[PDB]
Design a protein around this ligand. Structure first.
Ligand SMILES: [K+]
Ligand SMILES: [Mg+2]
Ligand SMILES: [Mg+2]
Ligand SMILES: [Mg+2]
Ligand SMILES: [Mg+2]
Ligand SMILES: [Mg+2]
Ligand SMILES: [Mg+2]
Ligand SMILES: [Mg+2]
Ligand SMILES: [Mg+2]
Ligand SMILES: [Mg+2]
Ligand SMILES: [Mg+2]
Ligand SMILES: [Mg+2]
Ligand SMILES: [Mg+2]
Ligand SMILES: [Mg+2]
Ligand SMILES: [Mg+2]
Ligand SMILES: [Mg+2]
Ligand SMILES: [Mg+2]
Ligand SMILES: [Mg+2]
Ligand SMILES: [Mg+2]
Ligand SMILES: [Mg+2]
Ligand SMILES: [Mg+2]
Ligand SMILES: [Mg+2]
Ligand SMILES: [Mg+2]
Ligand SMILES: [Mg+2]
Ligand SMILES: [Mg+2]
Ligand SMILES: [Mg+2]
Ligand SMILES: [Mg+2]
Ligand SMILES: [Mg+2]
Ligand SMILES: [Mg+2]
Ligand SMILES: [Mg+2]
Ligand SMILES: [Mg+2]
Ligand SMILES: [Mg+2]
Ligand SMILES: [Mg+2]
Ligand SMILES: [Mg+2]
Ligand SMILES: [Mg+2]
Ligand SMILES: [Mg+2]
Ligand SMILES: [Mg+2]
Ligand SMILES: [Mg+2]
Ligand SMILES: [Mg+2]
Ligand SMILES: [Mg+2]
Ligand SMILES: [Mg+2]
Ligand SMILES: [Mg+2]
Ligand SMILES: [Mg+2]
Ligand SMILES: [Mg+2]
Ligand SMILES: [Mg+2]
Ligand SMILES: [Mg+2]
Ligand SMILES: [Mg+2]
Ligand SMILES: [Mg+2]
Ligand SMILES: [Mg+2]
Ligand SMILES: [Mg+2]
Ligand SMILES: [Mg+2]
Ligand SMILES: [Mg+2]
Ligand SMILES: [Mg+2]
Ligand SMILES: [Mg+2]
Ligand SMILES: [Mg+2]
Ligand SMILES: [Mg+2]
Ligand SMILES: [Mg+2]
Ligand SMILES: [Mg+2]
Ligand SMILES: [Mg+2]
Ligand SMILES: [Mg+2]
Ligand SMILES: [Mg+2]
Ligand SMILES: [Mg+2]
Ligand SMILES: [Mg+2]
Ligand SMILES: [Mg+2]
Ligand SMILES: [Mg+2]
Ligand SMILES: [Mg+2]
Ligand SMILES: [Mg+2]
Ligand SMILES: [Mg+2]
Ligand SMILES: [Mg+2]
Ligand SMILES: [Mg+2]
Ligand SMILES: [Mg+2]
Ligand SMILES: [Mg+2]
Ligand SMILES: [Mg+2]
Ligand SMILES: [Mg+2]
Ligand SMILES: [Mg+2]
Ligand SMILES: [Mg+2]
Ligand SMILES: [Mg+2]
Ligand SMILES: [Mg+2]
Ligand SMILES: [Mg+2]
Ligand SMILES: [Mg+2]
Ligand SMILES: [Mg+2]
Ligand SMILES: [Mg+2]
Ligand SMILES: [Mg+2]
Ligand SMILES: [Mg+2]
Ligand SMILES: [Mg+2]
Ligand SMILES: [Mg+2]
Ligand SMILES: [Mg+2]
Ligand SMILES: [Mg+2]
Ligand SMILES: [Mg+2]
Ligand SMILES: [Mg+2]
Ligand SMILES: [Mg+2]
Ligand SMILES: [Mg+2]
Ligand SMILES: [Mg+2]
Ligand SMILES: [Mg+2]
Ligand SMILES: [Mg+2]
Ligand SMILES: [Mg+2]
Ligand SMILES: [Mg+2]
Ligand SMILES: [Mg+2]
Ligand SMILES: [Mg+2]
Ligand SMILES: [Mg+2]
Ligand SMILES: [Mg+2]
Ligand SMILES: [Mg+2]
Ligand SMILES: [Mg+2]
Ligand SMILES: [Mg+2]
Ligand SMILES: [Mg+2]
Ligand SMILES: [Mg+2]
Ligand SMILES: [Mg+2]
Ligand SMILES: [Mg+2]
Ligand SMILES: [Mg+2]
Ligand SMILES: [Mg+2]
Ligand SMILES: [Mg+2]
Ligand SMILES: [Mg+2]
Ligand SMILES: [Mg+2]
Ligand SMILES: [Mg+2]
Ligand SMILES: [Mg+2]
Ligand SMILES: [Mg+2]
Ligand SMILES: [Mg+2]
Ligand SMILES: [Mg+2]
Ligand SMILES: [Mg+2]
Ligand SMILES: [Mg+2]
Ligand SMILES: [Mg+2]
Ligand SMILES: [Mg+2]
Ligand SMILES: [Mg+2]
Ligand SMILES: [Mg+2]
Ligand SMILES: [Mg+2]
Ligand SMILES: [Mg+2]
Ligand SMILES: [Mg+2]
Ligand SMILES: [Mg+2]
Ligand SMILES: [Mg+2]
Ligand SMILES: [Mg+2]
Ligand SMILES: [Mg+2]
Ligand SMILES: [Mg+2]
Ligand SMILES: [Mg+2]
Ligand SMILES: [Mg+2]
Ligand SMILES: [Mg+2]
Ligand SMILES: [Mg+2]
Ligand SMILES: [Mg+2]
Ligand SMILES: [Mg+2]
Ligand SMILES: [Mg+2]
Ligand SMILES: [Mg+2]
Ligand SMILES: [Mg+2]
Ligand SMILES: [Mg+2]
Ligand SMILES: [Mg+2]
Ligand SMILES: [Mg+2]
Ligand SMILES: [Mg+2]
Ligand SMILES: [Mg+2]
Ligand SMILES: [Mg+2]
Ligand SMILES: [Mg+2]
Ligand SMILES: [Mg+2]
Ligand SMILES: [Mg+2]
Ligand SMILES: [Mg+2]
Ligand SMILES: [Mg+2]
Ligand SMILES: [Mg+2]
Ligand SMILES: [Mg+2]
Ligand SMILES: [Mg+2]
Ligand SMILES: [Mg+2]
Ligand SMILES: [Mg+2]
Ligand SMILES: [Mg+2]
Ligand SMILES: [Mg+2]
Ligand SMILES: [Mg+2]
Ligand SMILES: [Mg+2]
Ligand SMILES: [Mg+2]
Ligand SMILES: [Mg+2]
Ligand SMILES: [Mg+2]
Ligand SMILES: [Mg+2]
Ligand SMILES: [Mg+2]
Ligand SMILES: [Mg+2]
Ligand SMILES: [Mg+2]
Ligand SMILES: [Mg+2]
Ligand SMILES: [Mg+2]
Ligand SMILES: [Mg+2]
Ligand SMILES: [Mg+2]
Ligand SMILES: [Mg+2]
Ligand SMILES: [Mg+2]
Ligand SMILES: [Mg+2]
Ligand SMILES: [Mg+2]
Ligand SMILES: [Mg+2]
Ligand SMILES: [Mg+2]
Ligand SMILES: [Mg+2]
Ligand SMILES: [Mg+2]
Ligand SMILES: [Mg+2]
Ligand SMILES: [Mg+2]
Ligand SMILES: [Mg+2]
Ligand SMILES: [Mg+2]
Ligand SMILES: [Mg+2]
Ligand SMILES: [Mg+2]
Ligand SMILES: [Mg+2]
Ligand SMILES: [Mg+2]
Ligand SMILES: [Mg+2]
Ligand SMILES: [Mg+2]
Ligand SMILES: [Mg+2]
Ligand SMILES: [Mg+2]
Ligand SMILES: [Mg+2]
Ligand SMILES: [Mg+2]
Ligand SMILES: [Mg+2]
Ligand SMILES: [Mg+2]
Ligand SMILES: [Mg+2]
Ligand SMILES: [Mg+2]
Ligand SMILES: [Mg+2]
Ligand SMILES: [Mg+2]
Ligand SMILES: [Mg+2]
Ligand SMILES: [Mg+2]
Ligand SMILES: [Mg+2]
Ligand SMILES: [Mg+2]
Ligand SMILES: [Mg+2]
Ligand SMILES: [Mg+2]
Ligand SMILES: [Mg+2]
Ligand SMILES: [Mg+2]
Ligand SMILES: [Mg+2]
Ligand SMILES: [Mg+2]
Ligand SMILES: [Mg+2]
Ligand SMILES: [Mg+2]
Ligand SMILES: [Mg+2]
Ligand SMILES: [Mg+2]
Ligand SMILES: [Mg+2]
Ligand SMILES: [Mg+2]
Ligand SMILES: [Mg+2]
Ligand SMILES: [Mg+2]
Ligand SMILES: [Mg+2]
Ligand SMILES: [Mg+2]
Ligand SMILES: [Mg+2]
Ligand SMILES: [Mg+2]
Ligand SMILES: [Mg+2]
Ligand SMILES: [Mg+2]
Ligand SMILES: [Mg+2]
Length: 249
RNA sequence: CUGACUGGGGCCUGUAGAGCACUGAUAGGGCUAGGGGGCCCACCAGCCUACCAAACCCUGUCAAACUCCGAAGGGUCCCAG
RNA sequence: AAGUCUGGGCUAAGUGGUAAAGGAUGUGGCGCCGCGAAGACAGCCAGGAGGUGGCUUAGAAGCAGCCAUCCUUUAAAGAG
RNA sequence: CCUAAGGUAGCGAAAUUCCUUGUCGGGUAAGUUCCGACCUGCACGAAAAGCGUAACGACCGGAGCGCUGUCUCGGCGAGGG
RNA sequence: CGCCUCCUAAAAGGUAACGGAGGCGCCCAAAGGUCCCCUCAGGCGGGACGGAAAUCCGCCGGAGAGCGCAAGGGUAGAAGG
RNA sequence: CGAUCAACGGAUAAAAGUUACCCCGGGGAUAACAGGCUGAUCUCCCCCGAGCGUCCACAGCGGCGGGGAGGUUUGGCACCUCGAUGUCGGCUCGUCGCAUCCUGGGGCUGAAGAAGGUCCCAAGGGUUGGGCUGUUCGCCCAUUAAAGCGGCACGCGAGCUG
RNA sequence: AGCGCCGGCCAACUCCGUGCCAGCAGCCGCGGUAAUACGGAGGGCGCGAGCGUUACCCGGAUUCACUGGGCGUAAAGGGC
RNA sequence: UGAAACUCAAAGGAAUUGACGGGGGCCCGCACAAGCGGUGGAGCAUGUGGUUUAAUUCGAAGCAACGCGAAGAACCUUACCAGGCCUUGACAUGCUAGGGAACCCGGGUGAAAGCCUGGGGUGCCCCGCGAGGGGAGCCCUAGCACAGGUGCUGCAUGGC
RNA sequence: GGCGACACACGUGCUACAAUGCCCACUACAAAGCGAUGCCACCCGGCAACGGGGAGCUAAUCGCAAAAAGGUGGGCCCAGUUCGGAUUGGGGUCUGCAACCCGACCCCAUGAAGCCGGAAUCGCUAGUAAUCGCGGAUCAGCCAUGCCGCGGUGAAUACG
RNA sequence: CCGAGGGUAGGGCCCGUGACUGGGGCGAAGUCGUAACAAGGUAGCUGUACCGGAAGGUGCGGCUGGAU
RNA sequence: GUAAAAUGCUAAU
RNA sequence: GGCGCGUUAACAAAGCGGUUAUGUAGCGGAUUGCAAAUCCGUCUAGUCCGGUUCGACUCCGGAACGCGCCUCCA
């Protein structure tokens, strides 16, 4: 878990163009934090706002022990400043939603053909003397799930058996990569959620030069150094209160 | 009387078998280009390697279109039955 | 139709009279060392102990997993 | 990028759908057929017309009620053989 | 689908399969005749630009180069320059 | 001198398709059905023992490889049949095999009991009714001791259906 | 002796805490680091064995207008 | 002909003062036009963004931030970093305890800071020819109130 | 020690890219200021930066001081040059307790990019723009080519 | 005879519920454009018609609640 | 009958 | 399975035996209060393996992946 390379998905929340600009400043905060750990960040998918921001940034943190630290940052982050997008000198609250996921496996598929049963029969339709006599039709019934692929496409049984297994595997994989996406989906809705001004994990209020992790109460005042990548104290101050979640009896 | 077949005599041949000298393949070891890694330096290079490995060498092998070799036979001419 | 013919041996499976990897105190014939009255082998009679576990592990402590397997009364007792 | 130009309305697993008994819903104790939907239409589509449509049909589907020797499962009797 | 080279082809010749591999449908006025000279590839060392390889010098080197183009045979005591 | 007369011994100077509306002469010299040979594929059984099973290779399993049996699948071949060997499924009627679905007898069990797992013996008997589809097959409903798998020209059209 | 209330309506105010969070809310609205509007305290206002809230009826609503309204441009003259 | 659910705390009419118009009219400004020299390319200077940095102190941000604060950064400046000292502290005063100093010339020891050392001499009155004892600038250590902060809010502010 | 960093990018400027110019020697004409550990005459050592002397001036008196463009004479002849002066090497001067990062000036050698600058873009309407030198403040020395001043020479054009 | 009710068959109205489907209200931020408010950069609005991702456009006729 | 090159700018009194 | 075609950078898509393809993007600049539009500039290349050639993205032979077509008579 904590020792696998981990991928952080930075998005934009409420705020419009300034949410995407604050998300750009969270992007160069965990990337400058990367070399402050000897880690490796590879870009994967960015949607650059023409104003210099990102509506969505996805990067990796390739290093032995990334999900042991980045994991806390998953959640909604709050901003409140006078944006460069504002022209009446007013404070504007905006959000930028972060998601931290572990880089999973690209593991391949293969059929355990002891839980696979192959039925054979005569083919339904034309063919004359052949179709009435030849066992050209194949049904592969995946046993632990019940689903069945049939194939009487050609006249050959061994051709219609690969076309049946090929589709049995191709269909079983699209169901395996389906809960893989359902897990991937419900998990974000725990991290990101609605991304509204509430639900916040950390406020970066530029007026007061303060960065506050409201879930534990730790607040520093180095809002420039924190945004420059010195998030090590906030992670530690959550780390001590992380095992002070294990205080038993 | 020249025949099939047969005796002797010469010449032609590249298979069976075997071999590795050529063309390729080939396990391992030795030796040793270049690369990988490599304590480290880029001021300048060195040194390590139970790491992939060129070539060369040893041990050990493979081949219809490989042969330094090479039968038994086969063919043909001459004399004779 | 012609030997229930003669001499030597093997098989006990009706093998002969339908097949493979492999498996086996089936049976016979050759061997090669070994151990034996310095009493062998088999059986029985005993001793097979002890500092007693070193790691695992709240026991696994002579009989889970790991480390090499130190030594005494001795004819021999393996931290098994 | 290519084309002469890139399928409009309407309809769609269809007298059209390969995968296919697609998926969902209805009906059944149970429905590869049926009806209603959905639309990645293998391979609808606008006078080889498109989508509807009262009435009509010895056309071809699906369901129910009634009633039965069709059947469970056969029995007997009649006449022509 | 005709023609050439190798193999299959069982050491003369020949020998089949929708057997295994390749090539030809050109070209050269010199790439032809003759006379006269000359000898390679590759390895080491050395040498401005100049490198693995341009040209130059030494030593070793029988033919592994070259012979317009496939392959085989042939070949420096030349068929090669 | 004019040839991709390249189908390269070169029919004409000059030439493409379709037939389920079809026809005649021939062929089991040659395909589709069934049989036969074969057994790659198919089904079943073994060998080896890496590993699994808290512990323990073998209760139950068996990596990577190895050996067979059968003749139900799909094929390969083209040997009788093209002067005809009627083809799927259903119905009806059975009979056989046993690699056994149930019932009878066992051993092992990671078998307390009950109930199962696994292997061995056993072919006497038995092995239901329905929805869907032409279906074989399969799925589903309600039951069952059980709802076996195969051969017989994928048994049976001079027995029926179509 | 308790209950409601003290931003305006509407009578009754200061302190810390919080920092668009927690929360108040009948309407207008409060809260994003000096909140008489949130939570506590002190103080205050109103009633009193009660105080508040919820539901419903009439009023305020001349907002169905008989009393006692309107219809050029606010809703409202019928196309003639 | 003609609803309801749900939803909003408004939807509206006229008119007022503004602002605005790719409306109008009338004026003006090196605003264009008319000219003259430049900048944009080069090398250096300087300020700044950015990256780097142990720190590269901070403010300034279109015009109206950018040779601007800064009309003089090697130390100083200096607000930043590193390391070594500091402890009523550099400084203000007032409250005490021991001294009783004041101030001035050396020794170490460290990079200096700083920490440990070694000398002398104090007024005001007195009892005073007395030992010398007090009051008493200022000085030091044990405590005191309290200092100090270029640490933050120019979205609490004056002043400029 | 940093504020002075350097893959880059922007603003503000200096110096340029030549002959209406560069060079050298000689001869002119300002204004505003400033100056008692201050300005410095003049003399001499030093190619120089400077040094050692050393008057005069609390300063319309003494000095900074040379103004420079300008003028006379002579030269370089159209070239990355007698244009341009960056970069680097070596030798020194001074300030300052102290000059490595990181100062300024002098001398010798080096002699860069740059041939008048794409899209684009700034100033200036008369003693103005252009061009030329001088002074001041801050200041130990200075990275000032900056700021505020100061005089010298001195245009073109406004139809609208 | 009538007759509670039971039964059979066909009607009507109401309620809830339904694969899927139509748009509507709402939302401190999303994607595309910019139709209307200035002559809003093609004066606007209108009924109807045809068309287009979308606001809309265009045709015919009307209104001024348009302009200088 | 006058009369136009040119789109956009979220969200806190 | 048979036959034909194809693989180029960020995307899409071309020519070619020896050599800035091209459009849009992306990067630096200009313009703008800012952004788009626009204007000045600028940039990343040929799926793997083996042949041919002096030289291969380009030619030949294979693999891999994608497209298209065919798979009929029983
Ligand atoms: K036919
Ligand atoms: Mg996105
Ligand atoms: Mg704004
Ligand atoms: Mg099976
Ligand atoms: Mg069939
Ligand atoms: Mg059918
Ligand atoms: Mg047919
Ligand atoms: Mg068949
Ligand atoms: Mg004779
Ligand atoms: Mg003869
Ligand atoms: Mg002979
Ligand atoms: Mg022989
Ligand atoms: Mg041999
Ligand atoms: Mg060899
Ligand atoms: Mg051999
Ligand atoms: Mg051999
Ligand atoms: Mg041979
Ligand atoms: Mg020999
Ligand atoms: Mg002979
Ligand atoms: Mg002979
Ligand atoms: Mg003779
Ligand atoms: Mg006998
Ligand atoms: Mg005898
Ligand atoms: Mg037996
Ligand atoms: Mg027998
Ligand atoms: Mg037998
Ligand atoms: Mg179509
Ligand atoms: Mg159309
Ligand atoms: Mg239409
Ligand atoms: Mg449609
Ligand atoms: Mg459909
Ligand atoms: Mg269906
Ligand atoms: Mg249809
Ligand atoms: Mg169709
Ligand atoms: Mg179908
Ligand atoms: Mg079908
Ligand atoms: Mg179904
Ligand atoms: Mg259904
Ligand atoms: Mg149903
Ligand atoms: Mg019903
Ligand atoms: Mg039916
Ligand atoms: Mg339907
Ligand atoms: Mg679909
Ligand atoms: Mg049609
Ligand atoms: Mg059609
Ligand atoms: Mg037609
Ligand atoms: Mg048709
Ligand atoms: Mg037509
Ligand atoms: Mg129809
Ligand atoms: Mg009809
Ligand atoms: Mg009708
Ligand atoms: Mg009808
Ligand atoms: Mg009819
Ligand atoms: Mg009819
Ligand atoms: Mg009729
Ligand atoms: Mg019926
Ligand atoms: Mg019925
Ligand atoms: Mg019925
Ligand atoms: Mg009957
Ligand atoms: Mg029946
Ligand atoms: Mg009868
Ligand atoms: Mg009768
Ligand atoms: Mg021929
Ligand atoms: Mg020929
Ligand atoms: Mg031969
Ligand atoms: Mg031969
Ligand atoms: Mg021979
Ligand atoms: Mg011959
Ligand atoms: Mg042949
Ligand atoms: Mg023959
Ligand atoms: Mg070939
Ligand atoms: Mg060929
Ligand atoms: Mg020749
Ligand atoms: Mg000659
Ligand atoms: Mg050499
Ligand atoms: Mg060389
Ligand atoms: Mg040769
Ligand atoms: Mg050649
Ligand atoms: Mg060739
Ligand atoms: Mg031809
Ligand atoms: Mg021919
Ligand atoms: Mg012909
Ligand atoms: Mg002819
Ligand atoms: Mg002719
Ligand atoms: Mg012809
Ligand atoms: Mg014909
Ligand atoms: Mg037909
Ligand atoms: Mg027909
Ligand atoms: Mg007819
Ligand atoms: Mg006919
Ligand atoms: Mg006829
Ligand atoms: Mg016929
Ligand atoms: Mg016939
Ligand atoms: Mg005939
Ligand atoms: Mg015949
Ligand atoms: Mg024939
Ligand atoms: Mg046949
Ligand atoms: Mg057949
Ligand atoms: Mg067949
Ligand atoms: Mg037949
Ligand atoms: Mg057959
Ligand atoms: Mg037969
Ligand atoms: Mg077999
Ligand atoms: Mg067999
Ligand atoms: Mg087999
Ligand atoms: Mg077996
Ligand atoms: Mg185990
Ligand atoms: Mg065990
Ligand atoms: Mg296995
Ligand atoms: Mg085998
Ligand atoms: Mg076998
Ligand atoms: Mg059989
Ligand atoms: Mg059979
Ligand atoms: Mg047999
Ligand atoms: Mg066949
Ligand atoms: Mg067969
Ligand atoms: Mg035959
Ligand atoms: Mg046949
Ligand atoms: Mg034959
Ligand atoms: Mg026949
Ligand atoms: Mg007959
Ligand atoms: Mg007959
Ligand atoms: Mg007959
Ligand atoms: Mg048995
Ligand atoms: Mg049993
Ligand atoms: Mg039993
Ligand atoms: Mg039991
Ligand atoms: Mg039990
Ligand atoms: Mg049992
Ligand atoms: Mg057993
Ligand atoms: Mg039985
Ligand atoms: Mg039914
Ligand atoms: Mg049925
Ligand atoms: Mg069925
Ligand atoms: Mg089926
Ligand atoms: Mg039972
Ligand atoms: Mg059962
Ligand atoms: Mg059944
Ligand atoms: Mg049977
Ligand atoms: Mg048959
Ligand atoms: Mg049959
Ligand atoms: Mg059957
Ligand atoms: Mg039959
Ligand atoms: Mg029949
Ligand atoms: Mg039948
Ligand atoms: Mg029959
Ligand atoms: Mg018959
Ligand atoms: Mg019969
Ligand atoms: Mg018969
Ligand atoms: Mg029919
Ligand atoms: Mg109250
Ligand atoms: Mg009240
Ligand atoms: Mg009040
Ligand atoms: Mg309250
Ligand atoms: Mg209330
Ligand atoms: Mg806030
Ligand atoms: Mg406030
Ligand atoms: Mg407060
Ligand atoms: Mg409130
Ligand atoms: Mg209140
Ligand atoms: Mg309160
Ligand atoms: Mg009242
Ligand atoms: Mg009232
Ligand atoms: Mg009323
Ligand atoms: Mg009321
Ligand atoms: Mg009234
Ligand atoms: Mg009214
Ligand atoms: Mg109205
Ligand atoms: Mg009227
Ligand atoms: Mg009206
Ligand atoms: Mg109004
Ligand atoms: Mg101008
Ligand atoms: Mg210029
Ligand atoms: Mg310029
Ligand atoms: Mg620039
Ligand atoms: Mg510049
Ligand atoms: Mg500075
Ligand atoms: Mg910076
Ligand atoms: Mg400064
Ligand atoms: Mg300073
Ligand atoms: Mg400092
Ligand atoms: Mg500020
Ligand atoms: Mg102020
Ligand atoms: Mg400057
Ligand atoms: Mg500049
Ligand atoms: Mg001065
Ligand atoms: Mg001066
Ligand atoms: Mg030069
Ligand atoms: Mg040049
Ligand atoms: Mg020069
Ligand atoms: Mg120097
Ligand atoms: Mg320095
Ligand atoms: Mg020039
Ligand atoms: Mg003026
Ligand atoms: Mg000048
Ligand atoms: Mg000056
Ligand atoms: Mg100075
Ligand atoms: Mg009645
Ligand atoms: Mg009734
Ligand atoms: Mg309803
Ligand atoms: Mg608009
Ligand atoms: Mg419009
Ligand atoms: Mg506009
Ligand atoms: Mg417009
Ligand atoms: Mg318009
Ligand atoms: Mg209209
Ligand atoms: Mg239109
Ligand atoms: Mg217009
Ligand atoms: Mg314009
Ligand atoms: Mg536009
Ligand atoms: Mg937009
Ligand atoms: Mg605009
Ligand atoms: Mg918008
Ligand atoms: Mg290409
Ligand atoms: Mg591409
Ligand atoms: Mg193109
Ligand atoms: Mg082409
Ligand atoms: Mg280019
Ligand atoms: Mg390009
Ligand atoms: Mg750009
Ligand atoms: Mg811009
Ligand atoms: Mg190549
Ligand atoms: Mg090559
Ligand atoms: Mg290729
Ligand atoms: Mg046909």
């Amino acid at each position: 878990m904590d020792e696998r390379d981990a991928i952080v998905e930075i998005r934009a929340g409420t705020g419009g163009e300034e949410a995407a600009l604050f998300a750009r400043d969270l992007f160069n905060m965990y990337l400058r934090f990367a070399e402050e750990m000897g880690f490796e960040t590879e870009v994967l998918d960015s949607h650059p706002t023409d104003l210099g921001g990102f509506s969505k940034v996805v990067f990796e943190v390739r290093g032995p022990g990334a999900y042991g630290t980045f994991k806390y940052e998953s959640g909604v982050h709050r901003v409140q400043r006078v944006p460069v997008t504002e022209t009446q000198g007013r404070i504007h609250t905006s959000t930028a939603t972060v998601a931290v996921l572990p880089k999973a496996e690209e593991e391949d598929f293969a059929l355990n053909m002891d839980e696979i049963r192959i039925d054979v029969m005569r083919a339904s339709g034309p063919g004359g003397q052949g179709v009435n006599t030849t066992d050209s039709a194949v049904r592969v019934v995946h046993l632990p799930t019940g689903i069945m692929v049939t194939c009487q496409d050609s006249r050959s049984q061994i051709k219609n058996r690969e076309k049946a297994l090929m589709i049995l595997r191709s269909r079983l994989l699209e169901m395996k990569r389906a809960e893989e996406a359902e897990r991937l989906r419900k998990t974000r809705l725990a991290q990101i959620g609605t991304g509204e001004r509430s639900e916040k994990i950390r406020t970066y209020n530029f007026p007061q030069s303060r960065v506050t992790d409201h879930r534990i109460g730790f607040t520093t005042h180095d809002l420039e150094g924190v945004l420059s990548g010195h998030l090590t104290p906030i992670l530690e101050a959550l780390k001590r209160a992380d095992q002070e979640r294990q205080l038993a009896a």
